[PDB]
Design an enzyme around this catalytic site. Structure first.
Site, PDB file in Angstrom:
ATOM      1  CG  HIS B  41      46.627  -9.905  23.414  1.00  0.00           C
ATOM      2  ND1 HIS B  41      45.263 -10.126  23.461  1.00  0.00           N
ATOM      3  CD2 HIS B  41      46.898  -8.731  24.029  1.00  0.00           C
ATOM      4  CE1 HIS B  41      44.757  -9.099  24.124  1.00  0.00           C
ATOM      5  NE2 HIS B  41      45.700  -8.242  24.493  1.00  0.00           N
ATOM      6  N   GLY B 143      45.133  -1.542  28.038  1.00  0.00           N
ATOM      7  CA  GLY B 143      45.484  -2.061  29.353  1.00  0.00           C
ATOM      8  C   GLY B 143      44.336  -2.793  30.034  1.00  0.00           C
ATOM      9  CB  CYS B 145      43.608  -7.095  27.367  1.00  0.00           C
ATOM     10  SG  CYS B 145      43.432  -6.067  25.883  1.00  0.00           S
TER      11      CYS B 145
HETATM   12  O1  LIG Z   1      42.723  -4.332  21.253  1.00  0.00           O
HETATM   13  C1  LIG Z   1      43.602  -4.277  22.110  1.00  0.00           C
HETATM   14  N1  LIG Z   1      43.431  -3.675  23.308  1.00  0.00           N
HETATM   15  C2  LIG Z   1      42.326  -2.912  23.727  1.00  0.00           C
HETATM   16  C3  LIG Z   1      41.170  -3.453  24.288  1.00  0.00           C
HETATM   17  N2  LIG Z   1      40.063  -2.763  24.582  1.00  0.00           N
HETATM   18  C4  LIG Z   1      40.075  -1.457  24.344  1.00  0.00           C
HETATM   19  C5  LIG Z   1      41.178  -0.756  23.797  1.00  0.00           C
HETATM   20  C6  LIG Z   1      41.175   0.642  23.567  1.00  0.00           C
HETATM   21  C7  LIG Z   1      42.269   1.259  23.034  1.00  0.00           C
HETATM   22  C8  LIG Z   1      43.400   0.531  22.702  1.00  0.00           C
HETATM   23  C9  LIG Z   1      43.448  -0.819  22.914  1.00  0.00           C
HETATM   24  C10 LIG Z   1      42.341  -1.508  23.472  1.00  0.00           C
HETATM   25  C11 LIG Z   1      45.004  -4.841  21.876  1.00  0.00           C
HETATM   26  C12 LIG Z   1      45.956  -3.668  21.461  1.00  0.00           C
HETATM   27  C13 LIG Z   1      46.570  -3.829  20.077  1.00  0.00           C
HETATM   28  N3  LIG Z   1      45.616  -4.412  19.140  1.00  0.00           N
HETATM   29  C14 LIG Z   1      45.052  -5.609  19.478  1.00  0.00           C
HETATM   30  C15 LIG Z   1      44.739  -6.540  18.487  1.00  0.00           C
HETATM   31  C16 LIG Z   1      44.243  -7.786  18.831  1.00  0.00           C
HETATM   32  C17 LIG Z   1      44.091  -8.104  20.164  1.00  0.00           C
HETATM   33 CL1  LIG Z   1      43.623  -9.723  20.610  1.00  0.00          CL
HETATM   34  C18 LIG Z   1      44.363  -7.190  21.161  1.00  0.00           C
HETATM   35  C19 LIG Z   1      44.830  -5.921  20.826  1.00  0.00           C
END
Ligand SMILES: O=C(Nc1cncc2ccccc12)[C@@H]1CCNc2ccc(Cl)cc21
Ligand SMILES: O=C(Nc1cncc2ccccc12)[C@@H]1CCNc2ccc(Cl)cc21
Lengths: 304, 304
Positions: B41, B143, B145
């Site tokens: 992603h 950030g 990830c």
């Molecule tokens: O979840 C994700 N990242 C994060 C990861 N961990 C804690 C976070 C805290 C706060 C904002 C983001 C965070 C990303 C961002 C967008 N939405 C999304 C949807 C699916 C997938 Cl595969 C990745 C993502």
């Protein structure tokens, strides 16, 4: 989101760990530049630890009696000296992995990471606090002496603790990197009173702010209190008295959540008087006090 | 003595962390040999994450679009491929700091350390478990990830997790190092059911053995139980059913303390039915389940 008891990445400290042997005793040392720091009780046998005269024991020791090994390579000792309860072993080689460092004597209630080591090899890293009674609740077995506590600010490692002993109560005592014990403890196998272990009020409040930020809000109430009213409650529950300096340090967290410090104090007052009623806060069923206000901000902002 | 939620020393993993940028998205990658692993992603914008066709998005990307930075130095990308939910970026330089490593897909209930990273720079290290519902209760901000979970056996790092997302519930989902998600989760911003989060019974029992070893014995009783009787209680309290395989893994701890596994089960049964009555075990007011039997043995024996 999520809140964890996070330790600093230990790489910079792992590169400083060495094994120090003197006679039949082996413990860990910290190699920075051309000096190896280790607890002075490396010169003692178990017989000696009952009542040791460190100065008299050290006279019988020469540079060649201190065996210092960094991984599988031997360091050459060219000088030795005792500073308080630590020995400083001058070696002929500067540690090529020496990070930017400082030696700091932390305040009670401050937190730090510990890299537990055995035979100069790291086993694990965990976060803890210097208790108000100057002990630490660590995880140390025989051979862990010389393991260090530290904090990291960007590229600078601030060493604050060196492990020396376990009290019969199962808690731990040690020194700063100048060899001065935190608290009244001496490096002798004798009866040592730790003292009353109070709860670090400013850290509990910081953790309550961490809970609100991460969604746990059930404990918020419609009340407020004053510093003097809150402190009457804190006294009854063996909590440290909260001061205006503590209120000031909680300023950024109060600003982030919009919950006045005294309003959070009223939430804590009610939790002290009524308990959790079987509920949890950030996966804990008790009030956590080993997160400083700086720690909560750092973890909630992602400082690297 | 003392028992802590200890993480592995993170040095070996810190030396593998890099920053990966694609377009306007930046996350972390893991550089081992001449390959950088990161969540696929990284090719998405927030607009794309609602319903992304990764194959169609990746066609618009070339090697020069993947910016990989190790500290302050840029890595040259000579190949890119997608394996499940991870991208593999072939670079022209082998990581000189690559440790001995393996990629392993852990079982639910197993534990691992996480090195939380932002912009390829580590912020902290903590220990956690893969929950029975395949989520992890971590501490991750935007950030983070690409941050990885791992275990260390002497000199070999076994990478088991790569962080991908946060569910709306505040829990975390990710993949093994082959890019396959743990659980039913997909890398899409959509409603995702985590599932019932049960307690890891074998880990609670291991932690109860850790408590006895470290002096906390108040919960020991005059009773015993059977696996079937214990499991009726475990069902009622959303605990995983205990099997003879779990009893067998608790063998060494049972041998060390002299407390039969079924006798410890009776202690756990009583704690489930009666609660702690305001008491603590190893500084916790709830039953801890993120210590495996292997972890308790490792920490109580000082394996480096
Ligand atoms: O979840 C994700 N990242 C994060 C990861 N961990 C804690 C976070 C805290 C706060 C904002 C983001 C965070 C990303 C961002 C967008 N939405 C999304 C949807 C699916 C997938 Cl595969 C990745 C993502
Ligand atoms: O306490 C010490 N070491 C340890 C340190 N930490 C956890 C231990 C667990 C189990 C056995 C030893 C442990 C040493 C050993 C002898 N007694 C003693 C007395 C004074 C001083 Cl300065 C050091 C010591």
């Amino acid at each position: 989101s999520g809140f964890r008891k996070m330790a600093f990445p230990s790489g910079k400290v792992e590169g400083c760990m060495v094994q120090v042997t003197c006679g039949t005793t082996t413990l860990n040392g910290l190699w920075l530049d051309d000096v190896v720091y280790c607890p002075r009780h490396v010169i003692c046998t178990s017989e000696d630890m009952l009542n040791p005269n460190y100065e008299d024991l050290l006279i019988r020791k020469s540079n060649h009696n201190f065996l210092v090994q960094a991984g599988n390579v031997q360091l050459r000792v060219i000088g030795h000296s005792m500073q308080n309860c630590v020995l400083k072993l001058k070696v002929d080689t500067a540690n090529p992995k020496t990070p930017k460092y400082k030696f700091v004597r932390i305040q009670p209630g401050q937190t730090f990471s510990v890299l537990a080591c055995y035979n100069g090899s790291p086993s694990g890293v965990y976060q803890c606090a210097m208790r108000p009674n100057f002990t630490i609740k660590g995880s140390f077995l025989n051979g862990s002496c010389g393991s260090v506590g530290f904090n990291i600010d960007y590229d600078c490692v601030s060493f604050c603790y060196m492990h020396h002993m376990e009290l019969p109560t199962g808690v731990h005592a040690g020194t700063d990197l100048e060899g001065n014990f935190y608290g009244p403890f001496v490096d002798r196998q004798t009866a040592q009173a730790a003292g009353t272990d109070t709860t670090i009020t400013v850290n509990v409040l910081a953790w309550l702010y961490a809970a609100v930020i991460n969604g746990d809000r059930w404990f918020l109430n419609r009340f407020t209190t004053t510093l003097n009213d809150f402190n009457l409650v804190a006294m009854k529950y063996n909590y440290e008295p909260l001061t205006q300096d503590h209120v000031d340090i909680l300023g950024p967290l109060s600003a982030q959540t919009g919950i006045a410090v005294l309003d959070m104090c009223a939430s804590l007052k009610e939790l002290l008087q009524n308990g959790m009623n079987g509920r949890t806060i950030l996966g804990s069923a008790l009030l956590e006090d080993e997160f400083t206000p700086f720690d909560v901000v750092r973890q909630c902002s992602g400082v690297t």
